UniProtKB/Swiss-Prot annotation:
<protein>
    <recommendedName>
        <fullName>Cathepsin S</fullName>
        <ecNumber>3.4.22.27</ecNumber>
    </recommendedName>
</protein>
<dbReference type="GO" id="GO:0043231">
    <property type="term" value="C:intracellular membrane-bounded organelle"/>
</dbReference>
<dbReference type="GO" id="GO:0005770">
    <property type="term" value="C:late endosome"/>
</dbReference>
<feature type="disulfide bond">
    <location>
        <begin position="57"/>
        <end position="100"/>
    </location>
</feature>
<keyword id="KW-1015">Disulfide bond</keyword>
<dbReference type="GO" id="GO:1904724">
    <property type="term" value="C:tertiary granule lumen"/>
</dbReference>
<comment type="function">
    <text>Thiol protease. Key protease responsible for the removal of the invariant chain from MHC class II molecules and MHC class II antigen presentation. The bond-specificity of this proteinase is in part similar to the specificities of cathepsin L.</text>
</comment>
<dbReference type="GO" id="GO:0034769">
    <property type="term" value="P:basement membrane disassembly"/>
</dbReference>
<dbReference type="GO" id="GO:0005518">
    <property type="term" value="F:collagen binding"/>
</dbReference>
<dbReference type="GO" id="GO:0062023">
    <property type="term" value="C:collagen-containing extracellular matrix"/>
</dbReference>
<comment type="subunit">
    <text>Monomer.</text>
</comment>
<dbReference type="GO" id="GO:0002577">
    <property type="term" value="P:regulation of antigen processing and presentation"/>
</dbReference>
<dbReference type="GO" id="GO:0010447">
    <property type="term" value="P:response to acidic pH"/>
</dbReference>
<feature type="active site">
    <location>
        <position position="185"/>
    </location>
</feature>
<keyword id="KW-0645">Protease</keyword>
<dbReference type="GO" id="GO:0002250">
    <property type="term" value="P:adaptive immune response"/>
</dbReference>
<feature type="active site">
    <location>
        <position position="165"/>
    </location>
</feature>
């Protein structure tokens, strides 16, 4: 028994679409995105968290290379190890690699744990999005059709399950029988449907959307 559609934006758990620019920081926006929702759930406060904090501070120890890419899971581990992440207000995004300037005075969130979901399992991802909240995922975005996407249910026959771009699954549903994942990107408001893309669901792990899902939690 799961709901047929969910959209975590309607629950006030999704901050504004961000704009990564020419820095490969999608992993960091995916990670803060997922944690922003858990922060809202636990505290009632909706606050954008610092993607730049992760870019600058969750580096070699975490297998991450700032503007040259990273992992959402090891970004979560950084936040756990660091005992904090700064607000985006305090530590705003510059689309470049900088020296780590974390200050605990401006800590806006904490992270207690994270969970990695099994590869390709869109049924388990559906359960997680319904029962836990927005889920950080990777997709195969190396396709002109992705960059040019305007509206509708995205399907790309040449998509692979090898991911290269981090995004956030904030919901799911179906548009007249065509099932989709509701995805928040970090390419600004002029990408897709006001910064969002609806990507084909239950179509064989399309564009690797369920290849590497993960989500953080903030425990009492
Ligand atoms: C072929 C599959 C490998 N892969 N790719 C992603 C994946 C997932 C999401 C994205 C995306 F798109 F969301 F960012 C991407 S893009 C390429 C990122 N890259 C980040 C390193 C720099 C180059 C760019 C890749 C993941 C995987 C394997 C499992 N994942 C994890 O996060 C867990 C790993 C455990 C072992 N690691 C360690 O670092 C162990 N210690 C040394 C710390 C790496 C992480 C997710």
């Amino acid at each position: 028994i799961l709901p047929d559609s969910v959209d975590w934006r309607e629950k006030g758990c999704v901050t504004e679409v961000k704009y990564q620019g020419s820095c490969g920081a999608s992993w960091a926006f995916s990670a803060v995105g997922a944690l922003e929702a858990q922060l809202k759930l636990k505290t009632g406060k909706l606050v954008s968290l610092s993607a730049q904090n992760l870019v600058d501070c969750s580096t070699e120890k975490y297998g991450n290379k700032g503007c040259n890419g990273g992992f959402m899971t090891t970004a979560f581990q950084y936040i756990i190890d660091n005992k904090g992440i700064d607000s985006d207000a305090s530590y705003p995004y510059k689309a470049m690699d900088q020296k780590c300037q974390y200050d605990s005075k401006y800590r806006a969130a904490t992270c207690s744990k994270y969970t990695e979901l099994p590869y390709g399992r869109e049924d388990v991802l559906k359960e997680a999005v319904a029962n836990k909240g927005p889920v950080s995922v990777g997709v195969d975005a190396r396709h002109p059709s992705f960059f040019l996407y305007r509206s509708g249910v995205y399907y790309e026959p040449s998509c692979t399950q090898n991911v290269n771009h981090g995004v956030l699954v904030v919901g799911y549903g179906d548009l007249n029988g065509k099932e989709y994942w509701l995805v928040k990107n970090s390419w600004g408001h002029n990408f897709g449907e006001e910064g969002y893309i609806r990507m084909a669901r239950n179509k064989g792990n399309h564009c690797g959307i369920a290849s590497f899902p993960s989500y953080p939690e903030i425990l009492q």
